[PDB]
Amino acid sequence: GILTNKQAVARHFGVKQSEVVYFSVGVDLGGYKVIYDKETQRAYSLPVGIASGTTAVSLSTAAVLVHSAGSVDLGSLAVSREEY
Amino acid sequence: STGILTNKQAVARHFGVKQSEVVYFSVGVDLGGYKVIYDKETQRAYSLPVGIASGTTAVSLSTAAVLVHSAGSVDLGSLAVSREEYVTLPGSFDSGSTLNVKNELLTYTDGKYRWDGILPKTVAPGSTPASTGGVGLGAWISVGDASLRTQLANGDGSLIGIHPQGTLNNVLTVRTPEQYNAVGDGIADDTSKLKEMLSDINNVPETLPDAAAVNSYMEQVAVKIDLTKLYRFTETLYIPPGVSIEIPTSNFFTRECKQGLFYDPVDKNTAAISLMVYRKQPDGSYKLNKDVDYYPTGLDIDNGDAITCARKIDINNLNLITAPGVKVGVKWIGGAGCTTKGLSIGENTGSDITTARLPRVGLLQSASWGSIHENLR
Amino acid sequence: VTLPGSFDSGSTLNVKNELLTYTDGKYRWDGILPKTVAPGSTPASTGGVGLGAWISVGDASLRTQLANGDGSLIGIHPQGTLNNVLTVRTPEQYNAVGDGIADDTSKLKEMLSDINNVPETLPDAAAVNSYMEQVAVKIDLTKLYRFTETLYIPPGVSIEIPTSNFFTRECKQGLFYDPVDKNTAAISLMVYRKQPDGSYKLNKDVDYYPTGLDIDNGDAITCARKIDINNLNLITAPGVKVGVKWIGGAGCTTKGLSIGENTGSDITTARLPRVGLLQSASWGSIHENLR
């Protein structure tokens, strides 16, 4: 279920299945390349350089991700990456 | 197991092919009939060339996606490039990355790029395409819409083909003040823009070491200028050598000048436009004449006291209006062999001459042997 | 959906959103479906590109369309497209180097040829006279082009440079004639001479000039008209016999034609010709401010 979705998202972005993480409060974001929002059913490339130990605080409907080390508008990152 | 089947589906839906058309790479697998191949180790998929005979089996698949099979070889990365089937790597030139396949793109602040050189390619953090090989064959190649927009915006027209052959940059040779964002309403002060436009053509220093120095400036590429709007300026413009000025038509007793130059200085005891003549200094150097009343004599030209820097200047329909009270319109000094057609000075503002936009003295000329003024108004 | 294969392999399109990859980008079929594409096909050989046929799709296709077009994809003000206003020609369109070092001869010749390609041999009077009834085109020379064989200007040509040389020490824009055989002319208009068999051959003899009589009795036929020169700068290697042969140019006009370079004090090494200009059979010809 979650594993097949990870496969689908991974193939869309060209990453490994293990490089996709689902958002949840407290989830560790270190090392993942793509994050998936199970509520909106949208995926986003993660900014590079998120250290192991950095956990997710919140993810808005506008794709603003707040975590331990700060925050990132995944929407803006996706635009820069032409991922629409 | 069932994971393989679901993965084939994900891949199939991505490329728009059938689930049965996806094959996993493995030494010895039959490649015949399949449309897409999947590398389970790198977890990357590639469209396969059409025409693989049935019974043809896989031999090896490199991390650069070069596939060797029983009937030959094929670079799947190159094929992917031709089919615009790309993978945008995480990160960017700023973060750094390592590319292994020809169909991998790295994001830069102005668009994406693929690497056309030797693979693998390592990009250190803080890099730019420029600092890591440059753009062009065998190096970085611009890819995608965002990259095309920025290239078009920051180029010279080389991306635009024209007839019978060649590109747009090959035929764009005229300059305009609009390239420098001049307002052209005869109200805003466009002086700095006009001066930059001229400097970009022939930038001659106001002070020069010797005669050889001043003379070198008459040996530069000449450029044509097109003035289609009205430009207000407030300091004397000095036309450098190698300049052609053009305007569609010449004014003739016009009440309201709409195209050309409008000189509106604080100090009216000056000239609107002047050619360049350098005067000898005590120390032996030369300074550009900036004195309104100065004009060089034949003697000066022989004494070395004056050196002209007015040559290869052509004027076509230049209209020059001036604020009332301005002393001189045009100082045609040292312009030997320089020519003029339809030069039109002054505006027929209205009945009262004291408020008309024309100068006290229209044109003052010296040291201009061989110059021709055709239909001067 | 980008179909497997390509135009090389051939394919069959069934839906409007299917793309077929070619060497310069992708295309969708805008005509009747299904559409069969035989192996070894090209968009141009299977319907052409345009409404109702192959339609270019995607960024790769856009790049090649723009790169090989005429500017018709670029809108301009107040209306129309870029190709509607691009009328001038330049040696740069033909990749001339323009440094006055490289031999740009074939490029210049190709530029002239693309305007009016006049054969050096013609059957009769009517044939040569036809080349004077062709569309005229303006040429802009903004760099310095070295060439090594006499250039023959065909009728219907306008040549301009931003300014005219004047006792110029180092020519930067114009033509520099630098041949092996210096007993030649740098530039010449076209005059055809009658042959024993009645046919006509282009004059390529440096000393030849047609007489009024020649033109009258058909011994010579001019192919020099509708030619206008504004500011052409022509310098040449020291020792070149003639700079410009203005022969048979009736009604042809010139303004600011500037011949020769003020290279240095030694006239023996100055880049100027022995004879600047030689003119005959050019009634009604006007040279304004010739240098």
Numbering used by the authors:
A (entry chain B): 14 to 97
B (entry chain A): 12 to 388
C (entry chain C): 98 to 388
Reproduce, without paraphrasing, sentences from the article in which this PDB structure was first reported.
To identify possible sugar binding sites, the crystals were flash soaked in high concentrations of readily available mono-saccharides (mannose and glucose) and di-saccharides (α-lactose and α-maltose). Of these, binding sites of glucose, α-lactose, and maltose were evident in the difference electron density maps. The amine group of Lys662 forms hydrogen bonds with both the C1 and C2 hydroxyl groups. A water mediated interaction bridges the backbone carbonyl of Glu639 and the C6 hydroxyl group. A second water molecule bridges the backbone amide of Glu639 and the hemiacetal oxygen atom of the glucose.
The TSP1 trimer assumes an elongated rod-like shape of approximately 170 Å in length and 75 Å in diameter at the widest region.
